[model samples]
Target: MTFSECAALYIKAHRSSWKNTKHADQWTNTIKTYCGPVIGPLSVQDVDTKLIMKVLDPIWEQKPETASRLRGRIESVLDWATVRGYREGDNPARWRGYLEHHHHHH
Candidate 1:
């Protein structure tokens, strides 16, 4: 299935955990607004770091908070997809073992 399809399942499964219903609204809107036009139609297996980078690059500096949150959300959705057999291999949106090293320096 597509990344958008997986994301919808992820949101549906987790939406109830958020105390505020609007928080779920934000989750849906954020994914739709930022990711919908990009990787939304692409298969989950095709969502690699390059595509993920494309999605986050535009806002990574100008909107640091949103970028970070969006990244986290994407990571979560991809992970969920992996665990459910919709995709396999490392999550492209993962930050710790992958992007972190390439993303910055102290």
Candidate 2:
């Protein structure tokens, strides 16, 4: 499936659980605003580490809070896709052990 389609389903899946739009919109919109332009056109099955970097690197430290939240939100969507059999392997957007080093370096 395409990234945009996965994004839609991700939002729909999370929307009901939110029962409100402000925070939900923040998460979904941030995902779309960054991931949509680049990754959105790619197959969700094709999403990987380098592409995930395209979403976060530009604003990584310039906007720390927003960037951090966006990273987690992307991870959640990617994880969801994995569980649904649309993707495989570790989430490229995952933090801590894998990408936490990125948080401290250039």
Candidate 3:
């Protein structure tokens, strides 16, 4: 799926339960602003760690917590896609082992 398509599905899935549209918007907007420019046109199946980092790099340090949340959100969305056969393998966004390297440095 394209980024916009995935984002649309993500928003539809989360919109109703999101307590604050502002926060939800933050999540969506970041993907559009930072992530989209880099990897938005790629097929969901093509997104990988490098692309994920491309999305994270701009805000990873300046806003570590927000970046972390964005990572999780992206992971969740991709994992959902993976489960549904849109992609394959473990989530590139799985932070426990993968992102821990960056987390401690932040």
What's the ranking of the predictions by TM-score, best on top?
1, 2, 3
Clashing pairs in 1: none
* Regions more than 4 Å wrong, model 1: 96-106
lDDT of 1 at 4: 79
**TM-scores of all models?**
0.83, 0.80, 0.73
lDDT of each: 0.83, 0.78, 0.75
Candidate 3 lDDT tens digits, 33-64:
76787777787777888888876887866887
**Which model scores highest in TM-score?**
1
lDDT by residue for model 2 (52-99), tens:
777678886688678777777778888898888778776877754644
Best by lDDT: 1
Clashing pairs in 3: none
- The candidate with the higher lDDT, 1 or 3, is 1
Report the C-alpha lDDT of model 1 over 1-106, residue by residue, as the tens digit: 9887888888888877976678877877888889889998899889888898887889876897899788888888888888888888879788665445566655
